[PDB]
Design a protein around this ligand. Structure first.
Ligand SMILES: CC[C@@H]1C(=O)N(C)c2cnc(Nc3ccc(C(=O)NC4CCN(C)CC4)cc3OC)nc2N1C1CCCC1
Ligand SMILES: [Cl-]
Length: 112
């Protein structure tokens, strides 16, 4: 298909899949459960929550019109983690490692 089709296909079949398979993806595989995690303030602080399963469903459901919209959701997921947590926290180190992988896969995004 067209470049834009290949881009969203790449985000689903390669980028999302490889991030999910990474050993540090588990905190990012579901929405934050504020009661379970004992964090009453999470959704007061984070007003545009995002996670990999939401992104997965959106790609499956053909929700994104173009790749940039999907990339915005991945970046939001990482930014939320940096904003909510503190420097040096384990969850931040995990996010940073995942983001490094994300950036590597993006650097090979097709443009045709
Ligand atoms: C939401 C804040 C931040 C973040 O940004 N994301 C994305 C996140 C996504 N997922 C998780 N996952 C879990 C984190 C903690 C637990 C857990 O079992 N917490 C116990 C709760 C009861 N308490 C007595 C002892 C600790 C389970 C998790 O997943 C099932 N944590 C996340 N953190 C962490 C939240 C605490 C540090 C940072
Ligand atoms: Cl599900």
């Amino acid at each position: 298909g067209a470049a834009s089709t290949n881009q969203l296909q790449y985000l689903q079949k390669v980028v999302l899949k490889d991030l999910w398979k990474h050993s540090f993806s588990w905190p990012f595989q579901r929405p934050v459960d504020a009661v379970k995690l004992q964090l009453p303030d999470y959704y007061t602080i984070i007003k545009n929550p995002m996670d990999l399963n939401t992104i997965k469903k959106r790609l499956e459901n053909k929700y994104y019109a173009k790749a940039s919209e999907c990339i915005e959701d991945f970046n939001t997921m990482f930014s939320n983690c940096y904003l909510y947590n503190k420097p040096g926290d384990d969850i931040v180190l995990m996010a940073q490692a995942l983001e490094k992988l994300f950036m590597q896969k993006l650097s090979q995004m097709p443009q045709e």
